[PDB]
Amino acid sequence: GSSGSSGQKPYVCNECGKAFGLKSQLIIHERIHTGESGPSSG
Ligand SMILES: [Zn+2]
């Protein structure tokens, strides 16, 4: 059931707090904060 409660994930997101066992995995995720098709507010 859990999305993934097993595995060492050093790469943690400082925006939400999502951990990614891989580096690039986090880089792509952080993108959601960097900018999503413009400023959410609008
Ligand atoms: Zn995040």
Indicate which technique resolved this structure. Answer: NMR
Query: What is the Å distance from ligand 1's center to 26 Cα?
Result: 8
**Residue owning tokens 């952080």:** 30
Query: What is the Å distance from ligand 1's center to 23 Cα?
Result: 13
> Is residue 32 a contact partner of residue 40, using CB atoms and an 8 Å limit?
no
Query: What is the Å distance from ligand 1's center to 14 Cα?
Result: 7
Q: 3-42: b or e for each residue (b if 16 or more CB lie within 10 Å)? A: eeeeeeeebeeeeeebebeeeeebeebbeeeeeeeeeeee
Residue type, 21: G
Query: What is the Å distance from ligand 1's center to 39 Cα?
Result: 16
